[PDB]
Design a protein around this nucleic acid. Structure first.
Ligand SMILES: [Mg+2]
Ligand SMILES: [Mg+2]
Ligand SMILES: [Mg+2]
Ligand SMILES: [Mg+2]
Ligand SMILES: [Mg+2]
Ligand SMILES: [Mg+2]
Ligand SMILES: [Mg+2]
Ligand SMILES: [Mg+2]
Ligand SMILES: [Mg+2]
Ligand SMILES: [Mg+2]
Ligand SMILES: [Mg+2]
Ligand SMILES: [Mg+2]
Ligand SMILES: [Mg+2]
Ligand SMILES: [Mg+2]
Ligand SMILES: [Mg+2]
Ligand SMILES: [Mg+2]
Ligand SMILES: [Mg+2]
Ligand SMILES: [Mg+2]
Ligand SMILES: [Mg+2]
Ligand SMILES: [Mg+2]
Ligand SMILES: [Mg+2]
Ligand SMILES: [Mg+2]
Ligand SMILES: [Mg+2]
Ligand SMILES: [Mg+2]
Ligand SMILES: [Mg+2]
Ligand SMILES: [Mg+2]
Ligand SMILES: [Mg+2]
Ligand SMILES: [Mg+2]
Ligand SMILES: [Mg+2]
Ligand SMILES: [Mg+2]
Ligand SMILES: [Mg+2]
Ligand SMILES: [Mg+2]
Ligand SMILES: [Mg+2]
Ligand SMILES: [Mg+2]
Ligand SMILES: [Mg+2]
Ligand SMILES: [Mg+2]
Ligand SMILES: [Mg+2]
Ligand SMILES: [Mg+2]
Ligand SMILES: [Mg+2]
Ligand SMILES: [Mg+2]
Ligand SMILES: [Mg+2]
Ligand SMILES: [Mg+2]
Ligand SMILES: [Mg+2]
Ligand SMILES: [Mg+2]
Ligand SMILES: [Mg+2]
Ligand SMILES: [Mg+2]
Ligand SMILES: [Mg+2]
Ligand SMILES: [Mg+2]
Ligand SMILES: [Mg+2]
Ligand SMILES: [Mg+2]
Ligand SMILES: [Mg+2]
Ligand SMILES: [Mg+2]
Ligand SMILES: [Mg+2]
Ligand SMILES: [Mg+2]
Ligand SMILES: [Mg+2]
Ligand SMILES: [Mg+2]
Ligand SMILES: [Mg+2]
Ligand SMILES: [Mg+2]
Ligand SMILES: [Mg+2]
Ligand SMILES: [Mg+2]
Ligand SMILES: [Mg+2]
Ligand SMILES: [Mg+2]
Ligand SMILES: [Mg+2]
Ligand SMILES: [Mg+2]
Ligand SMILES: [Mg+2]
Ligand SMILES: [Mg+2]
Ligand SMILES: [Mg+2]
Ligand SMILES: [Mg+2]
Ligand SMILES: [Mg+2]
Ligand SMILES: [Mg+2]
Ligand SMILES: [Mg+2]
Ligand SMILES: [Mg+2]
Ligand SMILES: [Mg+2]
Ligand SMILES: [Mg+2]
Ligand SMILES: [Mg+2]
Ligand SMILES: [Mg+2]
Ligand SMILES: [Mg+2]
Ligand SMILES: [Mg+2]
Ligand SMILES: [Mg+2]
Ligand SMILES: [Mg+2]
Ligand SMILES: [Mg+2]
Ligand SMILES: [Mg+2]
Ligand SMILES: [Mg+2]
Ligand SMILES: [Mg+2]
Ligand SMILES: [Mg+2]
Ligand SMILES: [Mg+2]
Ligand SMILES: [Mg+2]
Ligand SMILES: [Mg+2]
Ligand SMILES: [Mg+2]
Ligand SMILES: [Mg+2]
Ligand SMILES: [Mg+2]
Ligand SMILES: [Mg+2]
Ligand SMILES: [Mg+2]
Ligand SMILES: [Mg+2]
Ligand SMILES: [Mg+2]
Ligand SMILES: [Mg+2]
Ligand SMILES: [Mg+2]
Ligand SMILES: [Mg+2]
Ligand SMILES: [Zn+2]
Lengths: 208, 124, 138, 83, 99
RNA sequence: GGCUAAUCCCCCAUGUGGACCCGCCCCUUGGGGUGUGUCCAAAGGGCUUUGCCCGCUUCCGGAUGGGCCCGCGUCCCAUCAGCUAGUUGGUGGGGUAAUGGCCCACCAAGGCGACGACGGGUAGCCGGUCUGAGAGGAUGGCCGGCCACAGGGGCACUGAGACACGGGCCCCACUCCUACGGGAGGCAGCAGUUAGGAAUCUUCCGCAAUGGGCGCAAGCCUGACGGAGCGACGCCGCUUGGAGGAAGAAGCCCUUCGGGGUGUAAACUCCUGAACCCGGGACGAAACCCCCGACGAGGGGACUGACGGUACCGGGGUAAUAGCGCCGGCCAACUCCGUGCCAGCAGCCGCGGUAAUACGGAGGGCGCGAGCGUUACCCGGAUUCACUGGGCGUAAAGGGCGUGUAGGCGGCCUGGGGCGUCCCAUGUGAAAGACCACGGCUCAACCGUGGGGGAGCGUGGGAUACGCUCAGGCUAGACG
RNA sequence: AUGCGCGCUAGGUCUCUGGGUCUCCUGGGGGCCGAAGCUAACGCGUUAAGCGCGCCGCCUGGGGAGUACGGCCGCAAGGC
């Protein structure tokens, strides 16, 4: 039961655009226009100098709220990363990016990540020929991700895919809008993602 | 100390002393009020603090704080000892748990309900 | 009677260098010589020679320093910053090959005495033997 | 006497048996002599059975006694063929 | 292998039996200094050969009595009476250290 | 008291062999061979009864499982310093499967102790587990291994095996039955009751699976087990929607009355479809058994479910739980009101006596979210018992001083040995766990298969610098 | 308010007591300033509180308390 409640408010508190809505976070309605300041009575007052703790906290919260996942899953995923051979920050970002819901967002099946979660949970999404309804499913390289045979009819899906004409997908992915499918090519590099998050600052957050 | 000296004697492990023989090891303990009264705290503060003398299921006798705004505890009531002190009182090593046995949860407290043991209010 | 002639030699070197002496006399022995040879090859000392002081054998050790420095305290850097006995009489440390420690990320050395002779850490690993861990130097 | 039987190693509704030489008086999941095989009744993988005949033959030769089910497995593995 | 130990005979005082003193060395498990412990063993000397102050070999054997699990295998060196001496003095020092 | 069968008991026989005394040989603790003398065997049943099955006896070996023995490791108190009479050893004997003061007789006078004996306190031990950068500290529930006990205590019988949880004898306590003489009992088995307690479950289903006992088999038994039930107790997955939606409704809060906040949040629009109904519906199951073959090998064939009509698949299909702690510093989150050293808070410093970001409520905010807090306990931080890794002139801490015992430590040169030390090989380090890889349940938790690692110890081989040791030598220490 | 021993690390100055070719130098003592260094600071500094090695003693927040109990010693006081 992750955060469910107003999203553009986190857009506001973190002081940066993180697109939880997809569309309209593109338009000048995001509230980041006209309210770049954090939420609440005091949000328009002068900021104090953030403690080291504060900085690292909020950085981690940025990274987390981006992917919509719970702190339990986030932390567990982090520890998983810190075990694995190779640089933690990158590896972490790579395991985050391999969440089926995420991959679905990334492929352009769903306007936002939350919507991608719902499409997954409702089984509109298949991996490697079989339906997968778990947002937390980890897509390994080579796995094909498609809109399910039946769900192809859905006006939402035909919509998004129609909007995905001519748009290019991530370089670690591939998309065929014809069969409404696409392949997860390889684990995305830090450089591959545009994320406004210093991850070595999140690493430092669990170091406490 | 020289190494030979440690071989001979060796460092000594430091024993820990229980701040709470509520004991029988337990997390909580049932008990019966003997006195219910007030006391005057230590030097820097002033107030009437509410406490109770309790006989215990451990066969122990201790002074306990009665945290909250209002309190219904009487002489013969049965009660649950929490443990943890009240710093500006004397030898009060335990708190009484509100909401269980004869100690009812604080009347009309909206904010921290779990401490003080009151259920959720009603909405219009 | 020195109670630990090796510790004594190392210490003499330490004191010597700390006042920037050009050289220092330690009472001579084979083992001390082997330790020296290792230093000299490693570059911590310029070298050493055998000499008779009061008709007694001594090893004269020629120390080595940095270039003169600037600002207040022109005194040059030490080539031997750190010289330390590890195994002492009264606690003798012996390491297997898997336990021969890397010193200062390689910038330093450890000297071991082994049944292949007195080696450095690198020497011992490459030779695949352990032994008594004599001292750290860096 | 020493026997050749199945020990249950799986999880709930997930039976996985080790084919095992053990004293009959031992409990089935307890310390055994040596594991000669494994058996996966739900056949979830390409190899759902394995044996290492030479061992099972040895044990049979010093007098181990197969459970008729372990016997069946062994036979399927070909412990018993002669020609 | 039947255990073999090496000791000095500190006691002649019994019939067909000698008390054999066996030192042992090892690194202290924490502090690391090499420390030397010791143990007295009752060993079986049927032919009454082995005298006081003998360094002998002891071997693990079928139990002869309660407390005698070892036999005297061979005489390694004869006439170490100083070892015995240290033993006797260590014993004698017990006479102090009470009241 | 009397009748009676047997694979029940016993006697003579056959001696493959075996046991015992004595002699001899080889091995060397009572191992193996051999000779004479002596001593010891058997059980019958079923069949299609001319041949086979199930069994029985003696012996040798195998396998498995145990007994006993030794080295080493195994908590606190020295305000426990001396302990010991079968005590320590010997000869002979008894006893057992077997060594043994295990037990008895006789003889000797020994044995243990500051390297902590004896005493007291506490405690099942381990694989592992928690924590920790590590060393270390702490722990030993569940699962696997070992031990011990079966109301307390003693004891033996039966047996291959027991000093025997659901076997026996005795004593003690307790409950019950009693014709007052006397008897019966033993959940630390499953489930259940009760008491104690802060607290711990169903008097369920099933023999279908794995395993166990007996039976030639058919089969019977199995509260081991495989399941289901109850408890957010733990872990993991999942949901309470998704997209659009105001230069931004109302209400509520702040207001310097200009406005600011809750906030795209809601309404609303559209879309998806947890729950739910219908349909289909398992894997776990193949042997035992039947046929051919010779009851074999091989080949073939059929019966077999608690979980369960569950999981799952297909069709239909409703916008559909959110709470809990905090917001003075440590520490992420601030304002208004009420209260006025009160009421209260409180982990520490501290806050409350009229502007309280610290009490109480409200708005708002931060953190987590089917949970969130609290108490208790363990490691942590704490380098605060310091091996890694601390100290002692004045902060705690040099003994009033010496003499010296045990012990610890030891100059230069050479040689022997190789105990420490190091290296190689090798055995051991079960499984589980931890690690790595690949895989199986849609994922994960969970699980499978594989690989690796690993201190320690056993055996064999090698090295010799250092430490030890033995032998020799020197004079710089030391003494004369 | 500074355990014992050993080796090592500038000098200056006053002094006690030996030796020397006796301004001075060379031992062994007592003091004072001060190199390097050390130290929380004060200070220490070849008479180390510096650099090292060996062995012994001792410490582990303040009080309660050098108290209580025990034991050993003592004629007692009282000591450990
Ligand atoms: Mg990593
Ligand atoms: Mg969601
Ligand atoms: Mg790529
Ligand atoms: Mg930490
Ligand atoms: Mg009491
Ligand atoms: Mg010079
Ligand atoms: Mg080793
Ligand atoms: Mg068994
Ligand atoms: Mg065969
Ligand atoms: Mg004798
Ligand atoms: Mg005997
Ligand atoms: Mg012999
Ligand atoms: Mg005595
Ligand atoms: Mg009769
Ligand atoms: Mg009769
Ligand atoms: Mg008759
Ligand atoms: Mg018979
Ligand atoms: Mg006969
Ligand atoms: Mg014959
Ligand atoms: Mg055997
Ligand atoms: Mg006392
Ligand atoms: Mg007696
Ligand atoms: Mg018997
Ligand atoms: Mg005997
Ligand atoms: Mg000893
Ligand atoms: Mg106990
Ligand atoms: Mg760990
Ligand atoms: Mg333990
Ligand atoms: Mg267990
Ligand atoms: Mg008992
Ligand atoms: Mg009884
Ligand atoms: Mg009993
Ligand atoms: Mg028993
Ligand atoms: Mg029973
Ligand atoms: Mg009760
Ligand atoms: Mg249950
Ligand atoms: Mg069954
Ligand atoms: Mg069965
Ligand atoms: Mg049978
Ligand atoms: Mg069960
Ligand atoms: Mg929406
Ligand atoms: Mg407004
Ligand atoms: Mg619809
Ligand atoms: Mg089947
Ligand atoms: Mg089936
Ligand atoms: Mg036939
Ligand atoms: Mg067949
Ligand atoms: Mg359906
Ligand atoms: Mg549908
Ligand atoms: Mg709604
Ligand atoms: Mg803050
Ligand atoms: Mg509070
Ligand atoms: Mg007011
Ligand atoms: Mg006010
Ligand atoms: Mg004020
Ligand atoms: Mg406030
Ligand atoms: Mg506060
Ligand atoms: Mg408040
Ligand atoms: Mg709120
Ligand atoms: Mg969860
Ligand atoms: Mg520590
Ligand atoms: Mg630490
Ligand atoms: Mg402490
Ligand atoms: Mg230390
Ligand atoms: Mg260590
Ligand atoms: Mg300290
Ligand atoms: Mg003194
Ligand atoms: Mg000595
Ligand atoms: Mg030496
Ligand atoms: Mg050797
Ligand atoms: Mg090995
Ligand atoms: Mg393993
Ligand atoms: Mg494994
Ligand atoms: Mg660990
Ligand atoms: Mg998988
Ligand atoms: Mg596992
Ligand atoms: Mg060897
Ligand atoms: Mg040699
Ligand atoms: Mg030599
Ligand atoms: Mg020595
Ligand atoms: Mg000599
Ligand atoms: Mg002092
Ligand atoms: Mg003093
Ligand atoms: Mg000192
Ligand atoms: Mg002077
Ligand atoms: Mg003169
Ligand atoms: Mg002087
Ligand atoms: Mg200075
Ligand atoms: Mg200074
Ligand atoms: Mg000075
Ligand atoms: Mg000096
Ligand atoms: Mg000098
Ligand atoms: Mg000194
Ligand atoms: Mg100091
Ligand atoms: Mg205190
Ligand atoms: Mg006094
Ligand atoms: Mg007296
Ligand atoms: Mg006095
Ligand atoms: Zn936005």
């Amino acid at each position: 039961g992750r955060y469910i409640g107003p999203v553009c408010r986190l857009c506001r508190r973190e002081g940066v655009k993180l697109y939880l809505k997809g569309e309209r976070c593109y338009s000048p309605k995001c509230a980041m226009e006209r309210r770049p300041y954090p939420p609440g009575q005091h949000g328009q007052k002068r900021a104090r100098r953030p403690s080291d703790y504060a900085v690292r906290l909020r950085e981690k919260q940025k990274l987390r709220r981006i992917y919509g996942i719970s702190e339990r899953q986030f932390r567990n995923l982090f520890e998983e990363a810190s075990k694995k051979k190779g640089v933690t920050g990158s590896v972490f970002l790579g395991l985050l990016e391999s969440r089926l819901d995420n991959v679905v967002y990334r492929l352009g099946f769903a306007v936002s990540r939350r919507q991608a979660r719902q499409l997954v949970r409702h089984g509109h999404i298949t991996v490697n020929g079989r339906r997968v309804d778990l947002p937390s499913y980890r897509v390994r390289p080579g796995d094909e991700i498609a809109v399910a045979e039946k769900s192809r009819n859905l006006e939402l899906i035909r919509q998004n895919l129609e909007a995905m004409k001519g748009r290019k997908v991530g370089p670690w992915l591939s998309l065929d809008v014809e069969g409404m499918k696409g392949k997860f090519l390889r684990l995305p590099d830090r450089e591959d993602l545009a994320l406004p998050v210093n991850e070595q600052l999140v690493i430092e957050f669990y170091s406490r | 100390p020289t190494i030979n000296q440690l071989v001979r004697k060796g460092r000594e492990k430091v024993r820990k002393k229980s701040k709470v023989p509520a004991l029988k090891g337990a997390p909580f303990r049932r008990g019966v009020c003997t006195v219910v009264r007030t006391v005057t705290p230590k030097k820097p503060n002033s107030a009437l603090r509410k406490v109770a003398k309790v006989r215990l299921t451990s066969g122990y006798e201790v002074t306990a704080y009665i945290p909250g705004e209002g309190h219904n505890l009487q002489e013969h009531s049965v009660v649950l000892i929490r443990g943890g002190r009240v710093k500006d009182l004397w030898g009060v090593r335990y708190h009484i748990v509100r909401g269980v046995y004869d100690a009812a949860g604080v009347k009309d407290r909206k904010k921290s309900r779990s401490k003080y043991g009151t259920k959720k209010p009603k909405e219009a | 009677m020195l109670t630990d002639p090796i510790a004594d030699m190392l210490t003499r070197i330490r004191n010597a260098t700390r006042v920037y002496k050009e050289s220092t006399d330690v009472p001579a022995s084979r083992f001390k010589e082997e330790i020296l040879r290792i230093l000299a090859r490693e570059g911590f000392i310029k070298g050493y020679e055998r000499v008779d002081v009061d008709g007694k054998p001594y090893l004269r050790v020629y120390l080595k320093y940095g270039p003169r420095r600037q600002g207040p305290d022109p005194r040059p850097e030490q080539v031997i910053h750190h010289i330390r006995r590890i195994s002492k009489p009264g606690r003798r440390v012996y390491v297997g090959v898997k336990e021969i420690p890397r010193v200062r990320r390689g910038l330093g050395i450890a000297i071991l005495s082994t049944s292949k002779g007195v080696l450095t850490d690198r020497e011992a690993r490459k030779l695949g033997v352990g032994g008594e861990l004599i001292c750290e130097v860096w | 006497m020493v026997k050749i039987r199945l020990a249950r190693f799986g999880s709930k509704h997930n039976p996985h048996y080790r084919i095992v030489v053990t004293d009959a008086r031992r409990k089935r999941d307890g310390k055994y002599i040596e594991k000669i095989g494994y058996y996966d009744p739900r056949k979830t993988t390409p190899d759902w059975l394995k044996v290492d005949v030479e061992r099972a033959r040895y044990w049979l030769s010093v007098g181990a006694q197969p459970t008729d089910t372990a016997r069946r497995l062994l036979r399927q593995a070909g412990v018993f063929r002669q020609e | 292998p039947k255990k073999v130990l090496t000791g000095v005979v500190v006691s002649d005082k019994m019939q067909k039996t000698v008390t054999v003193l066996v030192e042992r060395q090892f690194p202290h498990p924490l502090y690391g200094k090499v420390i030397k412990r010791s143990k007295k063993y009752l060993a079986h000397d049927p032919e009454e050969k082995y005298k006081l102050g003998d360094v002998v070999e002891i071997i693990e054997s079928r139990p002869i009595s309660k407390r005698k699990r070892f036999r005297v295998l061979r005489l390694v060196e004869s006439g170490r009476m100083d070892l015995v001496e240290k033993y006797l003095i260590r014993r004698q020092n017990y006479e102090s250290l009470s009241k």
